[PDB]
C-alpha cells in the first residue's frame, strides 16, 4: 500500500531513469546474477556473460515493465496481469528472488542516482518494489 507521497517519490525517482532504463535494468540483473547465483537457474536460455545483449535487452523491458508498473501504480494487478501469469503461473518464481532483484535495483539506483536516493525515496521504492513483487508472485486469475 503506497501513500500518495510514495507514488510521487517513485514517480519522481523512477522518472529520472529515463533513457538509461535499459542500462540500469541490465546492471540490476548483472548485480543479482553475480551476487545471488541461484537466480541464474531461471535464465538458462540467456547468455549469462557480462554485456550480453540478451541480458542488456531484457533489462530494458523490466525497466519499462516497472515504468509501466509506475504508470499503472494504482491499477497494478490489472496492468501486470500478463507478468503475473508469466511469473506466478508459468515460471513459478520463488518470492525470495523478487527480494533479491528488488535489492539489486535499489543498489543500482543508489549507485547511479545519489541525489535522488534520499531515505524517504529509498523507503518508497522498497515498498513499490515489494508491491510489484506481490503482484508478480500471486495467482489471481
Amino acid at each position: 500500500v503506497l501513500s500518495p507521497a510514495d507514488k510521487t517519490n517513485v514517480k519522481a525517482a523512477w522518472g529520472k531513469v529515463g533513457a538509461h532504463a535499459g542500462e540500469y535494468g541490465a546492471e540490476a540483473l548483472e548485480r543479482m546474477f553475480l551476487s545471488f547465483p541461484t537466480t541464474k537457474t531461471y535464465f538458462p536460455h540467456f547468455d549469462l556473460s557480462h554485456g550480453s545483449a540478451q541480458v542488456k535487452g531484457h533489462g530494458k523491458k523490466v525497466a519499462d515493465a516497472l515504468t509501466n508498473a509506475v504508470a499503472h501504480v494504482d491499477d497494478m494487478p490489472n496492468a501486470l496481469s500478463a507478468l503475473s501469469d508469466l511469473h506466478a503461473h508459468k515460471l513459478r518464481v520463488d518470492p525470495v528472488n523478487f527480494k533479491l532483484l528488488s535489492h539489486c535495483l535499489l543498489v543500482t539506483l543508489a549507485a547511479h542516482l545519489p541525489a535522488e536516493f534520499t531515505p524517504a525515496v529509498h523507503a518508497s521504492l522498497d515498498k513499490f518494489l515489494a508491491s510489484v513483487s506481490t503482484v508478480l508472485t500471486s495467482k489471481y486469475r
Binding site: 545471488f36 543508489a110 531515505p119 529509498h122
Partner: protein, 146 residues
C-alpha cells in the same frame, strides 16, 4: 565466508575510504526509515518522527558508529564470524529478541549505503563480495538461533 583474493582487495580498498563517523549512522537511519518497525527497539533514542529527524538524530549517528565498528571486526575475522559475534548474538537473540530477518535487512541497507557513497566504484563484482560479507555477519549474529 571465503572471498577470492581479488574480492578481499577490492573490499578492503573501498572500506578504507569509508567515513567511519557517518556511514554507520546512515545505515541505521535508513533501517529505521525504510523498515519503521525497527524503531521499536530504539524508543530510547528520542525524535524519530520524520526521516530528517531520524538521520539528524545525534543518538542515531552515535549508535551507528559502533555498528560500523562490528562490521569492521567482522571483516578482519572473515573465517571465524561466529566467534567474533558470539557475544553480540547472545545480546540480539537472547536479550533483545530481534527477529533475525532484520539482520539481513540492515546488511542490505549497509550495501545500499556503500553504493550511495561510492557510485560506479561500487561495481557488481564489488557488491557481490560485500553481499558475501553481510550474509556472513547476519548469520553469525543469528547464530544463537541456529
Amino acid at each position: 565466508v571465503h572471498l577470492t583474493p581479488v574480492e578481499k582487495s577490492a573490499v578492503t580498498a573501498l572500506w578504507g575510504k569509508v567515513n567511519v563517523d557517518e556511514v554507520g549512522g546512515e545505515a541505521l537511519g535508513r533501517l529505521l526509515v525504510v523498515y519503521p518497525w525497527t524503531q521499536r527497539f530504539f524508543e530510547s533514542f528520542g525524535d524519530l518522527s520524520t526521516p530528517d529527524a531520524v538521520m539528524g538524530n545525534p543518538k542515531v549517528k552515535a549508535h551507528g558508529k559502533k555498528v560500523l565498528g562490528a562490521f569492521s571486526d567482522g571483516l578482519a575475522h572473515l573465517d571465524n564470524l561466529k566467534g567474533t559475534f558470539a557475544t553480540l548474538s547472545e545480546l540480539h537473540c537472547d536479550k533483545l529478541h530481534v527477529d533475525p530477518e532484520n539482520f539481513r535487512l540492515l546488511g542490505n541497507v549497509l550495501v545500499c549505503v556503500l553504493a550511495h557513497h561510492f557510485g560506479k566504484e561500487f561495481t557488481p563484482p564489488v557488491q557481490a563480495a560485500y553481499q558475501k560479507v553481510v550474509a556472513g555477519v547476519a548469520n553469525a549474529l543469528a547464530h544463537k538461533y541456529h
